[PDB]
Amino acid sequence: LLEVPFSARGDRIPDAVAELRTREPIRKVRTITGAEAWLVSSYALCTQVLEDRRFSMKETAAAGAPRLNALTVPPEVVNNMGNIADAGLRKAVMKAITPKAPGLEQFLRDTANSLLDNLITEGAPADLRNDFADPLATALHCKVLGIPQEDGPKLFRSLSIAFMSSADPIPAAKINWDRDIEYMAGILENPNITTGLMGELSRLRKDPAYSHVSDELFATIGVTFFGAGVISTGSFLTTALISLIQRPQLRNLLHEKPELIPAGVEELLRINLSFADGLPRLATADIQVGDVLVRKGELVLVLLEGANFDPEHFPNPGSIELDRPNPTSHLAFGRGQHFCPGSALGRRHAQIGIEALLKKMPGVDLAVPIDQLVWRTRFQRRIPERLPVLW
Ligand code: HEM
Numbered sequence: 505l506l507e508v509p510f511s512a513r514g515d516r517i518p519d520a521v522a523e524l525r526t527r528e529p530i531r532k533v534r535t536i537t538g539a540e541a542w543l544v545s546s547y548a549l550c551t552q553v554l555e556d557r558r559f560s561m562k563e564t565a566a567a568g569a570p571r572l573n574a575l576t577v578p579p580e581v582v583n584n585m586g587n588i589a590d591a592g593l594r595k596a597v598m599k600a601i602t603p604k605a606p607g608l609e610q611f612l613r614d615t616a617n618s619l620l621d622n623l624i625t626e627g628a629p630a631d632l633r634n635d636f637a638d639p640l641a642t643a644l645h646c647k648v649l650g651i652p653q654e655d656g657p658k659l660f661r662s663l664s665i666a667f668m669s670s671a672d673p674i675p676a677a678k679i680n681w682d683r684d685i686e687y688m689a690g691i692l693e694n695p696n697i698t699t700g701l702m703g704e705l706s707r708l709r710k711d712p713a714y715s716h717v718s719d720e721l722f723a724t725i726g727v728t729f730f731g732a733g734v735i736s737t738g739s740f741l742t743t744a745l746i747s748l749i750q751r752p753q754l755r756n757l758l759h760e761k762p763e764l765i766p767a768g769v770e771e772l773l774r775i776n777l778s779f780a781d782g783l784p785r786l787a788t789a790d791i792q793v794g795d796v797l798v799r800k801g802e803l804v805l806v807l808l809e810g811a812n813f814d815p816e817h818f819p820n821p822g823s824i825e826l827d828r829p830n831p832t833s834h835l836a837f838g839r840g841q842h843f844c845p846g847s848a849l850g851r852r853h854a855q856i857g858i859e860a861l862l863k864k865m866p867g868v869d870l871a872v873p874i875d876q877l878v879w880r881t882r883f884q885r886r887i888p889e890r891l892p893v894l895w
Pocket residue numbers: 561584585586601728729730732733734736737740783784835836837838839841842843844845846847849850851
């Protein structure tokens with residue numbers, strides 16, 4: 505039985521995806537746990553699954569369910585956004601993580617420029633993942649959360665385990681989770697934390713309108729939004745920089761006309777291979793998806809690059825075109841009930857990071873042949889362990 509995932513490489517889509525999409529856009533596969541699942545790979549069927557709440561994220565955590573991979577958080581945290589919504593916290597969380605917070609964008613620009621100046625001083629080769637994209641993501645999320653910048657690196661170092669895609673429970677994930685929760689709980693008790701997401705959660709925790717909300721949920725919001733935001737923005741920016749480096753004509757165009765960078769980033773989102781696995785959902789009813797009657801209790805995997813390279817929806821899907829008529833209609837941020845709450849922040853992180861890099865390093869190029877990149881395995885993102893560049 506066809507095994508998923510197909511390839512940990514984030515620099516090229518396997519030819520097999522287009523064949524599946526054409527012939528079998530919903531197809532039985534085996535996951536790393538040995539479970540069977542339905543892999544959905546067309547824009548039409550991916551959108552159908554993501555927009556039908558009977559394909560449940562929450563129920564993927566149920567004991568005894570077929571699993572894509574092992575939990576790395578407590579099972580109730582899989583329903584984190586539902587818990588946030590039920591607690592009356594959605595609006596406050598969203599307001600806290602907007603890129604338009606006063607001074608946030610300038611902080612992003614200043615941080616990016618400082619990171620780049622240090623790389624220039626040290627001399628090529630430079631590692632754009634470990635010494636640019638990931639520190640930029642980490643610094644951004646410390647600022648957004650309102651926590652000390654110097655605490656970023658230790659929180660960041662949880663994530664190479666936190667976002668593993670493992671067949672089995674990971675003992676280090678429990679250690680790191682418990683430690684990171686204790687940290688966020690202490691932050692909520694720290695009177696000096698008055699800004700950002702944790703400053704606002706700290707205030708709401710003392711507000712009688714929220715007296716019922718548990719300390720557990722407040723700390724969980726901090727751990728989950730830091731982890732999801734840092735891994736997603738650092739990994740997306742890293743692999744978008746590869747796509748851009750691979751396209752010198754586009755790199756030069758965006759350097760010459762940086763007002764096109766938002767359109768460029770939107771296409772880089774569309775062609776991004778950062779998510780290593782399909783998005784998992786558990787059927788809570790018998791539901792017809794294409795030619796397959798998915799049965800209650802079965803696992804469905806929504807393959808984002810299946811949708812995003814679907815030529816019916818995005819003609820010439822492998823080409824970056826800055827004037828498509830349907831440019832934000834990709835699924836890079838998901839779709840439906842679980843659409844990424846951080847989407848605007850993720851866009852802005854990448855836009856500013858790329859703007860800064862192109863100004864400082866207009867000649868940026870890989871310093872090794874592209875096949876020498878080392879792609880992280882058994883992880884929820886596809887990323888190169890190092891991204892060596894020259895300029
Ligand atoms: C370019 C950057 C990002 C990408 C590509 C991305 C991608 C995604 C995708 C595809 C989903 C849907 C998962 C699903 O439906 O199963 C998602 C959800 C989520 N994202 Fe993002 N994300 C990014 C940035 C962020 C940021 C900056 C934050 C927070 C600061 C964040 C926090 C979350 C959370 C908490 C969820 C879960 C939502 C829910 O369960 O309803 N993400 N993200």
